[PDB]
Amino acid sequence: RPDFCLEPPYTGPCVARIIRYFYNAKAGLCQTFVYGGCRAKRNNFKSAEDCLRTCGGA
Amino acid sequence: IVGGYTCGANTVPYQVSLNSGYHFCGGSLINSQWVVSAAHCYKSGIQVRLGEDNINVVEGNEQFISASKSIVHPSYNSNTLNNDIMLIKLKSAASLNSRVASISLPTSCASAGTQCLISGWGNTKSSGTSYPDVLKCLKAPILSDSSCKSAYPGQITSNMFCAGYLEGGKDSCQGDSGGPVVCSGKLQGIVSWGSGCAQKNKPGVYTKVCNYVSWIKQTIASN
Lengths: 58, 223
Ligand SMILES: [Ca+2]
What we know:
With 58 residues, chain A is an alpha+beta fold. Chain A contains one helix and two strands, in the order ββα.
């Protein structure tokens, strides 16, 4: 329900080590994190550009 | 791999690393032109790295071959994770010879208690993050379907099996996905998912390869 841009990054149950971006509202910037490969939440982007376009300013 | 040991350079010749600008998943070579991995490891521009030990340094026995085809199981369910298997065709045939070899597919499924070898370049810490340079190994037993379902209520399908130790401390972890679970020289599982790493009562979950042998053989032969 709340702004998905403010949710902490979600690695998920799968065990891959895929680098994705998430918007870090505390730092005011899109940062990288490890995504496991499945069950991604919305604050998970394939590029800094996608992250900024979607969550910039949150 | 958490709680494992250094395998030793090229001691697991069928282990490959899937690279997309960095290591993100593992895989198992089953033929000079084909690799088996997990469906959730599907990515564009995959480069398969064979003959690897130190994943961060060129040691002289590596073969970097790009994927020409990455076929995810037609019934893979990205929500339940059922049918988490993928076949990758290599653009050129790999040169097999001691340090690079294929692993046999199973002729029958493995029973609970069967000791297996799980390997990968994934995180080695149950708390925190530390990625190894060299390949890590872990000996772990296949667990009963009953115990697997008890650990993960309503999440275990007929195409999944648990392996590891309920006490915790030994398990596969982020970066190991798609990698091998070999028992008695046969590829019985593919690193798929879990709950945290090496946590008590939360063993790793693996794709049950024995249920896909017919599909694997026919798919490889028709591509
Ligand atoms: Ca290397």
